[PDB]
Structure formats: C-alpha cells, structure tokens
Design a protein around this ligand. Structure first.
Ligand SMILES: CCCCCCCCCCCCCCCCCC(=O)OC[C@H](COP(=O)([O-])OCC(O)COP(=O)([O-])OC[C@@H](COC(=O)CCCCCCCCCCCCCCCCC)OC(=O)CCCCCCCCCCCCCCCCC)OC(=O)CCCCCCCCCCCCCCCCC
Ligand code: BCL
Ligand code: BCL
Ligand code: BCL
Ligand code: BCL
Ligand code: BCL
Ligand code: HEM
Ligand code: HEM
Ligand code: HEM
Ligand code: HEM
Ligand code: SF4
Ligand SMILES: [Ca+2]
Ligand SMILES: [Ca+2]
Ligand SMILES: [Ca+2]
Ligand SMILES: [Ca+2]
Ligand SMILES: [Ca+2]
Ligand SMILES: [Ca+2]
Lengths: 311, 41, 56, 83, 56, 57, 40, 56, 41, 58, 56, 42
C-alpha cells in the first residue's frame, strides 16, 4: 500500500491516458541511492603521453601521465575501493597483465569508450563510467546469467514460464527474456502491418516472450509502457515517444556489450563469475539503469574524464 | 433512554473516567520512553 | 468537567461505546505502527544497535 | 603546518590507498610492497611523486591531482622510483 | 449568544448531534493529518531532529 | 490504580465472547508479529547464526 | 448479559490473575529476547 | 488458579479440544514449512551426504 | 452454562491439565533434541 | 503418564467422527510428506540409483 | 498385533461408505503413482525399451 | 455421555483404539528403521 498523492507526469495528449505515476518518498530515497561520486580535481594535461612513459599501455595511449594516473585513481574508487590498486595489479609490477582483473579492466575501458563515443543515440552526452555498473563493487550488483528456473522431474521439460519470477517484474510470463533478446537478437516485433490476416506469421507465444521483455525493460527503467508507447498501437512508431527510439538503440547497444565485450572474457573470468550454464555475468538494462530512467538520474560523470572517450 | 438508571450512569461514569485516565497514563509512559529513545520532533 | 457529565450514559449506550473504543483503538494502534514503520522513524530495519544479518 | 591543498585523512582516495603523511604511522609493513624493504618506503623515493610540484616537504603526487603530499608519507600504491 | 439557545435541543436530537459531531471530528482529524503529512510541514520524514536510518 | 467495581464490566460485556475474541486476537497478533520480525534484519532463522547449515554440504 | 453480581466478581478474579500471568510470560519472553538480540 | 476448572462451565469442552487439535496440526505444519525455508533446512542440506551426487 | 456440573468441570480440568502437560513435556524433549542437533540461536 | 480415566474421552468426542478424521489426515499427511521428500536431495525416484533407466534407451 | 474384537468396527463405521471410499481412494492413488513414475527416470513408455518404435 | 456411548462401551473402544494406534505406530517405527538404514537424512 502507498499513500496519496503520487507524483505525476503527463506523457501524451490530454485524455489519452499516457501519464506516469510515482511515489514521491521512494523517488527521494532513490535519488539518495543514486548519488554520483564527486569527480577528481583536474590534472595537468601536459608532459609526455602515457604511450611513451609506461611499458604496457594498450588503450589509454594519448593521455598525459597526469590524466592517466588520475584515471587509475578514479577506476579504483568506482570498481575496487576496498582493495585498492592491487585489485588489478601485480604488486611491484604495474605493467604485468598476469592477473585476470587487469585483462578484464582493459576491455572494460574499451567498452566504456565505445559507449561514450559511438552510442550517443543511446547514452547522449551523459555517457557511462565504471561507476554506472560497478557502483563501488568489483562485481556489478545487477549483472545477470541465463536463468534455468525451477527444477522439474526428468520426464517433464521445463516451460520457461508459469513461475513467480522478478525478471519479468513478477508476472508469470517467460522469465528469461534476457538470453533470447539482450544477448542473442531474436525478433521482438509481433504486431501485423495489415488489418486482415494473410501476411503475419508471428505467434501468440512470441507475443508472450516480447511482453515479458517489455516488463523487464519497463521495470529496469522504473517506468510504465506509456513512457515509450501509446498502448492503443504498440507497434506504431509515429505514436510512440522518443524514448522508444532511444530504447531501440539501447537494445542493440546492450547486445554489443554482451556479445563483443563480456562473452569473449568468459574463459578468463573465474568460475565464480559464471552461471549454472557456464555463461558470464553480463549486462542488461538493469545493470546501468538500476530502476531509474537514466543511470544516476542523468548525472554527468564521464565528461570529467577525457580517457573515457575514443581516440 | 439507554435503559440505565441515573445512579447506574453515575457509577458507569466514575469507572469509565478512571479507566480512560489510566489508559491515557499508559499512553503517556510509552510516549515518554519513545521520546527518550527516538525523539521525532 | 461538569458535575452532571455522568448523564452522558443516559444518552449514549455504554456497551456500544466501549466496544467501539476497543475496536477503534486496536485499529488505530495497528495503523499508527504501520505509518511509523513507513517513515525514517522505522526502528526495526535501522541496523540499531547493529545489523544482525551482517553478523552472519 | 600543512598547506591548504594537502591530502587530508577524510579524502576518499587517501582512505582507499591507506595514505598517511607520516610513513611511520602507516600500514607499509602489512602490504609488503615489492622493491625495497617496507621500512624504507616513503614518498621521496616513489615513482609517482612529482618533484616539480609544491615546495619543501609538501610535493605533488600524480595520484592526488591538484593536491600535495608529504615526502615522509606512504600509501598502498608505493612503487620504487626507478626514474 | 441568545438566552433561549437551549431550546435548540427541543428541535434537534441530542444523541444524533453528539454522534454526528464525533464522526465528523474523527474523519476530519484523519483527513487533516494526511493532508499535513502531504505538505512541507510533514514532521515524520523531515529527518528532524535526526535521520535515524543514517545511524548505520 | 484500578477501581474497586471494575468487575462489573462483565455485567455489560459477555465474558465468553471476550475470552474467545482475546484468544483469537492474540493468536493472530502473535502470528503477525513473528512474520513481521522474520521480515526484518532481526530474522533469527536465516541469519546463519551460530552457523550456516547449508554450507556444511 | 445474564451474570449475577457475584458471578462477575468470581470471573473477574480469575480473569485478572490469568491475564497478569499471561503478561508475566510476555515480559519474560521479551527479557530473553532483549538479552539474546537487543533491537534498540 | 484454584477455581480455573470453572473455565469448563464457560467454554464448551468439546469445541475447545477440536480447536486445540486443529490449531496444533496447522501450527506444526506451519513451523516445519517456515524452518524448511531457511538455512536450518535439514532435508536438502546434503547431510550426511548428497544422494543425488551418489547417483551421478 | 456449558451443561457440565461443577464436579464434571473439576474432573475434566484435572485430565485436561495432565494431558496438556504430557504434550508440553514431549514438546520440550523434541526441542532439546533439535537444539542438540542443530542449535538455531 | 496418561490418566486412568482417559477412556472417558469417548464420552466427549464421537469415536466415529474421530476415526474418519484420523484416516483422512493420515492419508493426506502421508501424501504430503512423500512429496516434500521427493523435492529434496532425498528423492529416491530421480536419483538414478541403482541405474538410470532412460540412458538404456537413448 | 491385532485385537480379537476388531470386527466390531463395522458396528461403528458404515460398511457401504467405507467400501466405496476405499475403491475410490485406491483408484485415485494408483493413477497418481503411475503419473509420478512416468514423470521420472523410471518411465517405461518413452524409454525406447526394447526398441524405439518411431521410424524415420 | 454426549456422544451416546455408555461407560463400558467407552472403555471397550478405548482399549481397542489404543492397541490399534500402537500397532500403527509400530509399523511407522519399522518403516523409519528401514529408511534410516537405507538413506539416513540427519
Ligand atoms: C484433511 C484433514 C482431515 C479432515 C477430516 C474431516 C473431519 C470431519 O469432521 O469429518 C466428518 C464428516 C462429517 O460427517 P457426518 O455427517 O458426521 O457423517 C456421518 C458419519 O459420520 C459417516 O461415518 P461413516 O461410517 O460413513 O464413515 C465415513 C467414511 C468417510 O467418508 C468419506 O468417504 C470421505 C473420505 C474419507 C477419507 C478417505 C479419503 C481421504 C482423502 C483422499 C485424498 C486423495 C488424494 C490422492 O469412512 C471412510 O471412508 C474411512 C476412510 C477410508 C479410506 C480408505 C482407508 C481404508 C481404512 C484404513 O464426515 C465426512 O465428511 C467424511
Ligand atoms: C519508536 C517506536 C516504538 C513504539 C511506540 C509506541 C507508542 C508511542 C505507543 C505504542 C503502543 C503499543 N505498542 Mg508500539 N512501539 C514500538 C514497537 C512495538 C512492537 C514491535 C514489534 O517492535 C510491538 C509489538 C509494539 C506493541 C505495542 C502495544 C503493546 C501498544 C498498542 C496497543 C494497542 O493498540 O492497543 C489497543 C487498546 C486497547 C485498550 C485494547 C484492549 C484489549 C481488549 C480487551 C482486546 C480484546 C480482543 C478483541 C476484542 C479482539 C477483536 C475480535 C475479533 C473478532 C477476533 N510496539 C517501538 C519501539 N508503541 C501504545 C501503548 O503502549 O499504549 C499504552 C503507545 O502509546
Ligand atoms: C526481538 C523482539 C521483537 C518482538 C518479538 C515478538 C514476538 C515474536 C511476539 C511478540 C509479542 C508481543 N509483543 Mg514483542 N517484539 C519486539 C518489541 C516489542 C515492543 C517494543 C516497545 O519494542 C512491544 C511493546 C512489544 C509488545 C508485544 C505484545 C503486543 C505481544 C505480547 C502479547 C500482548 O498483547 O501483551 C501485551 C501486554 C503487555 C504487558 C505488554 C508487553 C510489553 C512487552 C514486555 C514489551 C515492552 C518492553 C520492551 C521489551 C522494552 C525493551 C527493553 C528495555 C530497552 C530494557 N513488542 C521486538 C521487535 N513480540 C508476542 C505475541 O504476539 O503474543 C501474543 C509474540 O509472539
Ligand atoms: C527474536 C525472535 C524470538 C522470539 C520472540 C518472542 C517474544 C518476544 C514472544 C514470543 C512468544 C511466543 N513465541 Mg516466539 N520468538 C522466537 C522464535 C519462535 C519460534 C521459532 C520457530 O523460531 C516459535 C515457534 C515461537 C513461538 C512462540 C510462542 C510459544 C509464543 C506466542 C504465543 C501466543 O501467541 O499466544 C497467544 C495465545 C494466548 C494469549 C492464549 C492464552 C494463553 C495460552 C493458553 C498460553 C499457552 C502457553 C504458551 C504458548 C507458552 C509459551 C511461553 C514460552 C515462555 C515461550 N517463537 C525467536 C527466538 N516469541 C511470546 C510469549 O512468550 O508469550 C508469553 C512473546 O511475547
Ligand atoms: C530441527 C528440525 C527437526 C524437527 C523438529 C521438531 C520439533 C522441535 C518439534 C517437532 C514436532 C513434530 N514434528 Mg518435526 N522435526 C524434524 C523432522 C520432521 C519430519 C520430516 C519429514 O523431516 C516430520 C514429518 C516431522 C513431524 C513432526 C511431528 C511428529 C511433530 C508435530 C506434531 C503436531 O503438530 O501435533 C499437533 C497435534 C496435536 C497436539 C493433537 C493431540 C495429540 C495427537 C492426537 C497425538 C500425536 C502424537 C505425537 C505426534 C507423537 C510424537 C512425539 C514424538 C516425541 C515425536 N518432523 C527435524 C529433524 N519437530 C513437535 C513435537 O515433537 O511435538 C511433540 C516439535 O515440537
Ligand atoms: C525415501 C523414502 C522412502 C519411503 C519412506 C516411508 C516411510 C518412512 C514411511 C512410509 C510409509 C508409507 N509409504 Mg513410503 N517411502 C518410499 C516410497 C514409497 C512409494 C513409492 C512409489 O516409491 C509408495 C507408493 C509408498 C507408500 C507408502 C504407504 C504404504 C505408507 C503410508 C500410508 C499412509 O499414509 O497411511 C495413512 C492411512 C492410515 C493411517 C489409515 C490406517 C492404516 C491402514 C489400516 C493400513 C493401510 C496399509 C498400511 C499403510 C501398510 C504399511 C506397510 C509397510 C510398512 C509399507 N512409499 C521411499 C523409498 N514410506 C509409512 C508407513 O510405513 O506407515 C506404516 C512410513 O512411515
Ligand atoms: C591505483 C590508484 C592504481 C595505480 C597507481 C595504477 C597504476 C597503473 C599504471 C602505472 C599502469 C601502467 C603500467 C605500465 O607501465 O604499463 C596501469 C595500467 C592499467 N591499470 Fe592501473 N593502477 C591503479 C588501479 C587500477 C585498478 C583498480 C584497475 C582495475 C580496475 C586498473 C586497471 C589498469 C589497466 C586495465 C591498465 C592497462 C591500461 C591500458 O591502457 O592498456 N588500475 N595502472
Ligand atoms: C570502467 C572502465 C570499468 C572497469 C575498470 C571495470 C572493471 C571490471 C573488472 C575488474 C571486472 C572483473 C571483476 C571480477 O573480479 O570478476 C569487471 C567485470 C564486469 N564488469 Fe566491469 N568495469 C568497467 C566498466 C563496466 C561497465 C560500464 C559495465 C556495465 C555495462 C561493466 C560490467 C561488468 C560486468 C558485467 C562484469 C562481469 C562480472 C564480473 O566478472 O564481475 N563494467 N569489470
Ligand atoms: C510495458 C510493459 C510495455 C509493453 C506492454 C510493451 C509492448 C511492446 C510490444 C508489443 C512491442 C512490439 C511492437 C511491434 O510488434 O512492432 C514493443 C516493442 C518495443 N518497445 Fe515496448 N512495451 C512496453 C514498455 C516499453 C518501454 C518503457 C520502452 C522504452 C524504454 C519500450 C520500447 C520498445 C521498443 C524500442 C520496441 C521495439 C523493439 C524492436 O523492434 O527491436 N517498451 N513493446
Ligand atoms: C536495456 C536494453 C536498456 C534500455 C531499454 C535503455 C533505455 C534507455 C532510455 C529510453 C534512455 C533515455 C531515458 C530518457 O529519459 O531519455 C536511456 C538513457 C541512458 N542509458 Fe540506457 N537503456 C538500456 C541499457 C543501458 C545500459 C546497459 C547502460 C549502461 C552502459 C545504459 C546507459 C544509459 C545512459 C548513460 C543514459 C542517459 C542518456 C541521456 O539521455 O542522458 N543503458 N536508456
Ligand atoms: S603514490 Fe607514492 S608518492 Fe604518492 S602518496 Fe602514495 S606512496 Fe607517496
Ligand atoms: Ca533497531
Ligand atoms: Ca521530525
Ligand atoms: Ca539463528
Ligand atoms: Ca540432512
Ligand atoms: Ca532410485
Ligand atoms: Ca519400455
């Protein structure tokens, strides 16, 4: 039970019913829980580039030594503040890559730089830092693995649904839409483009998988369907909000992160980072958004770190 | 009008007021303890 | 108060008043506890004096 | 007698790195950082100290941009000054 | 006030008026508290004198 | 401080129904309070104190 | 209700002793709980 | 109390027995189900051994 | 009021209490075994 | 230690209504306990002991 | 150990209702047990023993 | 006698009830002896 009045926002034209409601007190506590860590003081951007001072810099080549050191301090607070520099570094040998966390972190740098430079259709000018996902934890709190669901006897094939699962916001819809849609790239559209039957082979069961994914997307951003759709015509882009366009690119962004950045790290990640199917903990909308329509309520962290952008 | 004689209403009132005051007393003790432990204003 | 306040029981039924008080008080007490637990004053999940699940 | 931009104990980076401005009140022994015996590791002989920032015992550090450390301090990111 | 105001109870039922006042007041009391709690005057979630969830 | 004639409460309220209401209310309350406590940090069953017994396997 | 005046005296006597007895157990149980897991 | 036996002059002995029996069975089922939902679970704890492992 | 005579209420109470103590006695023993096997506090 | 007059329980409770209830409860409890055990590591049907009979055919 | 007067149970429980309930319970229990076993590794219908009969 | 049994009838039924209950409990104990030997659970 909650108490009135809720916070409200009008999304669509008056009377169409596209409106958002939220709890004011939960918003205030969420805002408290999504504070951005204050950016480090600016460093001197002069002197030799990191490419010519250090021994094994493969990504951050063009940073000055000051900007490079500043970046290492920042990522330590964002990822491994309790452990410190040596979470990713062999003691007494900064150049060595002979610890799995450094190999992973190097690709994470490329992940973030690709996000900040190439996916502005999604992350705009706000961008992402290590903090967006890690939040001061080496292992992101909201990573996911393929969910096997409840146990069945050996003579009954699991249905993948009809179970109370948080992943689809506690509906009984197919409870793992992440693997088929945010890892693999199965088709999400099911609505026909013609009034009369004859040219739409999509199925009712595909509708349920898509519906399950949309619960997860909505739940991951803390919004209702009307944040992106006019639900009298879910398929109709002309009646949707610009957030739907953003969400479209974000789905493809998430696919790129898991297939090209996370999955190739599976063999070097320890078994503790893997699910029952051997797959690595990886990325969904929840991993960055964490139940907010914008990660950290849109806090601009990446802009204060030039090393978080490509070339 | 309620069935109660004027003396019964006198006796019920005496017992009602003494009991309500004692309950209010328990309420005050509990709110003092709560204020000592967790002042809310 | 007034010397003749006792006459209130010539107008209102003593038994119905009592039961209504008992019903109102139990409901208000359940309601107020719920209201307080939903605020910053929550005394159960404040990890005071300690968090006992972090002890495990 | 520390300058205004000195690294202070409440600085988050100092906490994560276990910084102290007096290396004898530091955790240099526990970390056993390689390159020298932990009883000789302080700021003056660390690769990350910028001799061209600050003045006196209060020099610059790379890890603490815009701030100053003390040459007699230590933190858990200690690395021999080879250069 | 008029001298013969007491004649109001010759035309209005004393018991219903007493009950009507009691019901109105309890409802109004709950309504005003919920109203005040929905404004800047809210004294429960104002972290005053202190935030108790912040103590750990 | 109680009154001397408080026993006359049973001339107004049925003692049997009060008893059954008290018994019913108290059982309900005890079930409710235990489940409330089990839903907070104070939970004494899943706290792995003194030990986690699933970790033994 | 039907009870005579003496029947109210007798029931009230047993009720109050019983209720105080129940309340005494509640106090002991809360003492055990405070000693084991203090909540304030 | 010495006169506690009179409780059977007030409350039907036959329904009280049935209510006690009915309440105790449900409570016993409830408490087992609660304990089996926690770390104290003694059935799926692989103690003394995991029998599903024995069959792999 | 229930139909039992005073002597009947006395006889029923003696057996009821004796039986309930036997049941409560068994409960303590079971709890003792449970505490020896899997102490929970 | 039972009471000598415990047989008098059948002066209060109907023996017939009691017997049917015990049978129904015991049947249901038996069904219930079997299912709980099957849901755990103790499962004696899907444990492939002595052997797995589906492997024999696939 | 059985009692010599066990036949007197039919002075207590109706023979007709007992017989009907037994065959109803046994039929339902037998359906249930066959269901459980089919849903496990013990399945004798889909085990391809002595052969698989689904030809290409 | 609220059920309608006489005092001797209530005594005869009790004797046969307790014996049958113990025989059932004997079976339950024997069954659990085999289960502990086959698959101890504690
Ligand atoms: C669940 C918890 C237990 C609740 C039990 C119900 C409590 C109750 O008050 O029942 C009385 C309730 C009230 O009856 P009444 O009006 O007093 O009955 C007149 C006579 O008492 C009628 O007396 P009667 O002579 O007709 O006896 C009735 C009949 C019982 O009447 C029935 O047929 C109903 C079912 C009895 C239990 C058997 C099935 C249990 C559930 C099976 C679940 C299958 C899932 C797989 O007797 C039986 O069938 C005994 C059960 C035999 C089952 C097979 C085992 C063989 C013997 C060992 O009787 C029933 O409804 C039954
Ligand atoms: C900082 C917050 C404080 C706190 C602040 C306060 C304050 C302040 C007060 C209370 C009060 C109470 N609190 Mg609190 N409370 C805290 C934590 C708790 C916890 C807990 C799990 O942590 C519990 C269980 C309680 C419990 C209690 C009660 C003992 C009491 C309210 C009784 C009531 O509503 O009376 C209802 C009133 C009656 C008169 C009931 C009469 C009984 C009748 C005879 C019942 C018969 C049964 C009935 C007829 C059944 C209906 C029939 C159905 C058909 C079955 N507190 C914390 C530590 N609490 C109040 C109190 O102590 O009052 C003295 C109070 O003023
Ligand atoms: C870890 C301990 C848990 C908790 C676990 C349980 C569980 C579990 C149950 C109860 C039950 C009850 N608890 Mg408790 N209870 C807690 C805290 C409280 C507080 C409080 C001020 O914090 C209060 C007033 C209560 C009150 C109550 C009653 C409503 C109820 C007993 C029946 C009854 O009606 O008696 C009212 C008659 C009285 C005389 C009031 C009793 C007052 C008790 C003794 C508490 C006040 C003192 C309290 C311990 C103060 C702290 C100590 C000092 C700091 C040293 N609980 C904390 C959060 N409580 C039981 C129940 O429902 O029984 C039916 C039950 O099963
Ligand atoms: C931190 C949490 C604490 C804890 C804190 C408390 C506190 C605090 C209280 C209880 C109380 C009770 N708890 Mg608890 N409880 C814990 C864990 C458990 C577990 C469990 C599976 O872990 C169980 C089954 C129980 C069970 C019980 C009951 C025996 C009792 C509630 C009776 C009631 O509602 O009467 C309502 C019924 C009536 C009023 C009817 C009339 C009287 C009846 C006939 C009384 C019969 C005797 C009674 C059951 C005897 C038991 C008292 C013992 C001292 C425990 N506790 C843990 C260890 N528990 C309460 C208690 O002891 O009350 C005295 C109480 O105040
Ligand atoms: C730590 C986890 C422990 C455990 C801890 C406890 C504890 C602690 C207790 C029980 C109790 C019970 N447990 Mg357990 N229990 C465990 C595992 C099991 C398993 C299982 C599949 O693993 C089962 C089926 C049971 C079953 C039962 C019942 C025998 C009993 C509840 C009866 C009841 O509610 O009567 C309610 C019905 C009535 C009162 C009706 C009136 C009398 C009836 C007609 C006669 C009943 C006979 C009685 C059951 C005889 C058995 C006593 C023995 C000492 C066990 N336990 C594990 C190993 N269990 C309780 C118990 O022993 O009670 C004495 C209890 O307090
Ligand atoms: C790993 C766990 C074990 C196991 C552990 C146990 C244990 C432990 C017990 C049982 C008991 C029973 N098990 Mg099992 N059980 C296993 C596998 C099975 C399988 C199966 C398909 O695999 C089946 C169908 C059964 C079936 C049964 C019933 C015959 C019986 C409970 C009946 C009941 O509730 O009566 C309730 C009905 C009444 C009380 C009414 C009166 C009884 C009437 C007069 C008699 C009916 C026939 C009687 C039950 C015969 C029992 C004979 C043998 C001891 C089996 N078991 C596995 C291998 N099973 C219980 C038992 O033997 O009880 C004696 C028991 O305690
Ligand atoms: C802690 C604040 C910290 C310091 C100091 C630090 C230093 C450091 C250096 C000097 C290098 C370059 C070494 C060389 O000569 O090649 C370097 C490189 C990387 N580091 Fe680092 N580092 C610190 C902390 C961390 C932490 C906590 C991580 C992991 C999250 C991390 C990761 C990396 C990575 C990756 C590189 C390689 C970068 C590249 O461009 O290839 N560092 N670090
Ligand atoms: C930012 C540049 C950044 C760094 C640095 C970083 C580091 C890092 C490490 C060291 C790991 C391995 C942790 C471990 O011990 O297993 C790791 C793993 C994951 N990360 Fe990461 N990470 C950075 C950025 C980001 C961002 C922006 C996201 C979210 C999109 C993200 C997510 C993940 C995931 C998923 C993992 C795998 C699970 C795991 O091994 O812990 N990272 N990261
Ligand atoms: C709310 C829970 C919700 C529902 C329901 C919903 C439905 C839905 C459907 C049926 C489709 C398929 C449309 C078609 O067949 O062409 C669909 C597609 C997209 N949605 Fe959605 N949707 C809900 C919520 C949200 C929210 C909150 C957003 C925006 C963040 C969003 C976005 C999208 C996007 C993008 C698509 C297109 C995906 C693709 O074609 O690859 N949805 N939705
Ligand atoms: C998951 C597939 C996913 C969806 C869906 C999604 C949607 C989304 C929207 C609609 C916005 C715009 C919100 C608005 O109010 O305009 C948005 C914004 C950001 N996102 Fe996102 N997003 C998904 C996943 C992820 C992941 C995994 C990350 C982190 C790597 C991420 C990041 C961001 C950031 C940053 C923004 C803010 C951009 C801005 O306009 O300010 N998203 N997302
Ligand atoms: S990095 Fe080196 S020079 Fe800088 S504060 Fe730490 S120990 Fe001193
Ligand atoms: Ca507390
Ligand atoms: Ca306040
Ligand atoms: Ca415990
Ligand atoms: Ca076990
Ligand atoms: Ca087997
Ligand atoms: Ca076969």
């Amino acid at each position: 039970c909650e108490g009135p009045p809720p916070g409200t926002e009008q999304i669509g034209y008056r009377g169409v019913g596209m409106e958002n409601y939220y709890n004011k007190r939960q918003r205030a506590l969420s805002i408290q829980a999504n504070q951005p860590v204050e950016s480090l003081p600016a460093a001197d951007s002069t002197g030799p580039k990191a490419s010519e001072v250090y021994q094994n810099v493969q990504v951050l080549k063009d940073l000055s030594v000051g900007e490079f050191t500043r970046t290492m301090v920042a990522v330590t607070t964002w990822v491994s503040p309790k452990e410190g520099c040596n979470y990713c570094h062999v003691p007494g040998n900064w150049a060595s890559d002979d610890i799995y966390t450094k190999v992973v972190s190097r690709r994470m740098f490329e992940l973030v730089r690709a996000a900040n430079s190439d996916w502005k259709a999604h992350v705009a000018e706000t961008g992402v830092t290590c903090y967006t996902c890690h939040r001061g934890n080496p292992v992101p709190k909201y990573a996911w693995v393929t969910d096997p669901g409840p146990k069945y006897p050996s003579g009954l094939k699991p249905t993948g649904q009809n179970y109370g699962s948080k992943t689809v916001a506690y509906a009984s819809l197919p409870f793992d839409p992440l693997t088929p849609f945010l890892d693999q790239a199965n088709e999400i559209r099911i609505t026909g483009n013609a009034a009369l039957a004859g040219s739409n082979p999509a199925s009712l069961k595909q509708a349920e998988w898509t519906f399950g994914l949309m619960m997860n997307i909505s739940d991951s951003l803390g919004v209702g369907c009307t944040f992106c759709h006019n639900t009298r015509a879910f398929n109709d882009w002309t009646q949707s909000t610009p957030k739907r366009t953003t969400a479209w690119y974000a789905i493809r962004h998430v696919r790129d992160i898991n297939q090209n950045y996370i999955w190739p790290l599976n063999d070097v990640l320890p078994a503790s980072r893997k699910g029952p199917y051997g797959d690595p903990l990886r990325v969904s909308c929840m991993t960055c958004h964490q139940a907010v329509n914008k990660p950290l309520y849109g806090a601009q962290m990446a802009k204060d770190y030039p090393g978080l952008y490509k070339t | 009008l309620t069935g109660l004689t004027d003396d019964e209403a006198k006796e019920f009132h005496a017992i009602f007021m003494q009991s309500m005051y004692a309950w209010f007393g328990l309420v005050v003790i509990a709110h003092l303890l709560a204020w000592l432990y967790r002042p809310w204003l | 108060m007034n010397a003749n306040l006792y006459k209130i029981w010539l107008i209102l039924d003593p038994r119905r008043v009592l039961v209504s008080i008992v019903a109102f008080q139990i409901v208000l007490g359940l309601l107020i506890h719920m209201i307080v637990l939903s605020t910053d004053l929550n005394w159960l999940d404040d990890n005071i004096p300690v968090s006992y699940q972090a002890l495990g | 007698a520390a300058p205004a931009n000195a690294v202070t104990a409440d600085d988050p980076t100092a906490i994560a790195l276990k910084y102290n401005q007096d290396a004898t009140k530091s955790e240099r022994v526990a970390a056993a950082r390689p390159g020298l015996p932990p009883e000789e590791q302080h700021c003056a002989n660390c690769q990350f100290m910028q001799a061209n920032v600050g003045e006196g015992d209060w020099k610059g550090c790379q890890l603490f941009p815009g701030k100053l450390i003390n040459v007699n301090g230590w933190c858990a990111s200690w690395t021999l000054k080879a250069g």
